[PDB]
Amino acid sequence: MPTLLRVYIDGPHGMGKTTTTQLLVALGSRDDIVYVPEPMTYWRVLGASETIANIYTTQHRLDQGEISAGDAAVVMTSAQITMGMPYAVTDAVLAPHIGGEAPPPALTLIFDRHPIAALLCYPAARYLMGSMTPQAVLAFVALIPPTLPGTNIVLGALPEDRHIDRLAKRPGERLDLAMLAAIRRVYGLLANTVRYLQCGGSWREDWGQLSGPQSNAGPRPHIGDTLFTLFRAPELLAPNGDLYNVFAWALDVLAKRLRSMHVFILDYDQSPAGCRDALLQLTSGMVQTHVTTPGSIPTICDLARTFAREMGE
């Protein structure tokens, strides 16, 4: 059976993910590598109208006190459902084609973001910004689809100053430095969480250490430097100080989903061609998988091209 290499480029927006991905894709033949782009058309028109603008405007109004936290939360929750829909459906239809982890792959699929971006990372950042409740975040977490074998996720590293500059120049988006800090923090925590879990970390065991980044490498992070630290919110705690079991189970799910992922860190603090080559080098250590059928490869290509054509900018 031919092999497949799936690579999800994720991390805070504004670092150069899209450019780097396009450049990498431009290196290979036409049908040896395919790009599943940002589904902007879905967010702007198909799933809803100007979702990105609606999100930034809602956050803005909240920060201005023009709307309540509850009003912002319902809007953000609904908006994130729209945001993640394309990722979710793609994963659901791709799942049957993915076999065990496996040598040139017959096909490389590069994704612009993974489902956890819309089901975990941004919701978590909105939570830190006061525009989403922690319960809604955990509901999203409980909905994260089972992690498929060979889930290679590439996160990005970039100095905040450089990130801010790059963002202060380059939809309906607004320049929110607080959101940038929050999303940068969430993705940093995410990387540590994966490393924490792969180093044998048990959140239930270390929860008490919770009172007052890189993966595939380094020592085991302290739980306080992982995503688990975000869910110590009073809303999730029972009178006795412990997490309600329903939320604790959502954390068990978070652990299960993240522990099997293969996370890599890409340094975006360089030229476009530089990032491309760095990413190319990174793919050398990524995990490939066998496909379930002989026709899976062509089917996957069609799926990717169909997705790109319909929801890509």
Added chain:
Amino acid sequence: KMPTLLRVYIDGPHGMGKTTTTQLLVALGSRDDIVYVPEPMTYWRVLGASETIANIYTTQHRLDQGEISAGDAAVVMTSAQITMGMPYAVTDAVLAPHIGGEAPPPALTLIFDRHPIAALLCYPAARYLMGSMTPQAVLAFVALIPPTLPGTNIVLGALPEDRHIDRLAKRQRPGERLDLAMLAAIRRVYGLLANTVRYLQCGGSWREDWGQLSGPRPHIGDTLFTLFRAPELLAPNGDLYNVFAWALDVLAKRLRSMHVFILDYDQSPAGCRDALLQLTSGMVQTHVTTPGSIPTICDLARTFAREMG
């Protein structure tokens, strides 16, 4: 070989039963070979958010009165459904790893108050029919329906509409408002769901029959697929956008492997309880994945009941 497990999801339109019928189910779970996972009302009223049900019905009411727009309503309904389904989704996520392949007497029987599709498909679809939810949101929820594991036995209630109104009227939940339009919508959705499973099990291909919605198994017009001929999901030329077609492919995948059983609620609580037991003979059992799965599932089920009532 690992012990066997029998999972039963009691679903269908709410308000068909009686308090005594439920207590019998609680009684059923008294023995350690059977556990009854009740509705997570505490999660809906307090843990996940404040009075979620009240919020849902007030929102629809305000939409009907024209106090709010369809858009405002949809945002509220979508957010509320995420809260409503969270207990089911988290339960499925943690239980899933314990379910093995299809398989005497089950070592354990888990009777759940509802399946995740109730909150991820059925109520959302009903609200769509009530004009309070976009069809894109419904398909987004559908895209998140957990994979259907072996032994997914879902019991759907059957009851004449007038009798259903009678029972619903006498057992309204906190914040609920007696809405006959919503009753009709949810009853239709579940009727369509039952037909859909049969349509799929008999080899129906929604893509092949799609053209019939605009032109032995149920007619596609009598399945959930007819609800997605919604204009918002179609391109200028009338074709369904691929992203939504894929969501329908997911729906077909999830529903085909479900084992539906119809429970007639038009009888006494003892009758309904007996009818349920009668239905178990044809239900599919599965093996668990580990020797410790049974005890774990039991703890999970009991903890859920105790914490979320």
